[PDB]
Structure 1
Amino acid sequence: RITTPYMTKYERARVLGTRALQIAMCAPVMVELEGETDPLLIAMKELKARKIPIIIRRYLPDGSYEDWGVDELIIS
C-alpha cells in the first residue's frame, strides 16, 4: 500500500459525516456513549476510540482501490 498513512482532513470530514448520518439512521453505536445524544459528537468519540466500522478505497490515479481501515489511518 503506497499511500500516506495519515487520514486526510477530507477523509476525516467524510468519515465523520457518514458515520453520524448512519448513527442518526439507527446504526448501532460502538462506543460507551455517556450523556451524548448528538450524532456528530458520537461519531467523534467513535473515531477517537478507533471504532468506526468503515474502510476507505483510496483510488490512485491509475485505478488501484487502496483499502485502508479507518482504525489504521493515523488520525490527528
Structure 2
Amino acid sequence: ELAILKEERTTTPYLTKYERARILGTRALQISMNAPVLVDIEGETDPLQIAMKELSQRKIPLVIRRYLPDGSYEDWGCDELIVD
C-alpha cells in the first residue's frame, strides 16, 4: 500500500549527500557503540573512518526508506544504491 514494489521503483538510484551523511553518522554511532564491523580495520581506529571505508566497499546493512510526498514509501538498499 504505502510500499511500492521493487520492480516499479522510480526514485533515483544514486545516493544523495543527505543519505550519505545520515548513513555514515548512523553506522559510525553503531560502530562506536559495539556494533559489528563489516570490513577490515588496519589503522583507522576512528569509527567514522571505519564507516567511510565500509561504505566505500558497499558493505553496510541499512535500507533507506524514502517517503513520497503523498505518504507512500519505497525501500532502497544501501547495497544497490550507486555511490558516486
Q: TM-score per shorter chain, which class?
A: over 0.9
Asked which structure has the greater RCO (Cα within 8 Å, sep 6+), the reply is 2
Matched, 1:56 2:60: no
- Tell which structure's C-alpha radius of gyration is larger: 2
Aligned-pair identity in percent equals: 79
TM-score normalised by structure 1 residue count: 0.95
Q: 1:35: how far off?
A: 1.4
**Two-structure CA RMSD over aligned residues (Å):** 0.7
Q: Deviations over 1:25-55 (max 9, x none)?
A: 0000010111121010000011010011100
Shift of 1:65: 1.6
Corresponding residue for residue 22 of structure 2? 14
CA distance in 1 between partners of 2:51 and 2:14 (Å): 18
Distance 2:14 2:68 in 1: 15
Equivalent-residue separation in structure 2 for 1:43 and 1:68 (angstroms) = 19
Unaligned runs of 5+ in 2: 1-8
State the Cα distance separating 1:69 from its structure 2 match: 0.5
Count of aligned pairs between the two proteins: 76
Q: Show structure 1 runs of 5+ residues with no match.
A: none
